[PDB]
Design brief:
27% helix, ph1033 like fold, YTH domain-containing protein 1
Length: 164
């Protein structure tokens, strides 16, 4: 049912995440962590302190799909165990230094073909699949986008609902 999921998403903020490789999304799905560039890191930290939930919606560049979505459980943190990200060509470990803990809500794919009817009012009403890394998604558009994902039987919402 969607009651639990709609409760998680009430008054949520939503951010598109674009990763240049599948391998970092695989790592993030197993371990429940994410790191991003400093501009977006500052944005997500601000959003985490202000919003009831902050949802990251993941899409790998050129995949034609979203790979899932997750909810911040902490602000970024430096000085923890070093995540062994596969670093893109022009990026260093210090640039992905801040580590957010995330709880995945869905780790299944959603093709762009199934979200073609949704447009993001905060990105000039372009289809929600269009956007740069960190593009914030307006509340109703991001809620509907999250509801399009199929149910993930590997996920238990209880842990998220409990720490809210």
């Amino acid at each position: 049912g969607t009651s639990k999921l709609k409760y998680v998403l009430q008054d949520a903020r939503f951010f598109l995440i674009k990763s240049n490789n599948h391998e970092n999304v695989s790592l993030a799905k197993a371990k429940g962590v994410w790191s991003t560039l400093p501009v977006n890191e500052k944005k997500l930290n601000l959003a985490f302190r202000s919003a009831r939930s902050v949802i990251l919606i993941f899409s790998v560049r050129e995949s034609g799909k979203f790979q899932g979505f997750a909810r911040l459980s902490s602000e970024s943190h430096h000085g923890g165990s070093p995540i062994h990200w596969v670093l893109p060509a022009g990026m260093s470990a210090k640039m992905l230094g801040g580590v957010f803990k995330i709880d995945w809500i869905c780790r299944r794919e959603l093709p762009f073909t199934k979200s073609a009817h949704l447009t993001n009012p905060w990105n000039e009403h372009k289809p929600v699949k269009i956007g740069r890394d960190g593009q914030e998604i307006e509340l109703e558009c991001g809620t509907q986008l999250c509801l399009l994902f199929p149910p993930d039987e590997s996920i238990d919402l209880y842990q998220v609902i409990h720490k809210m």
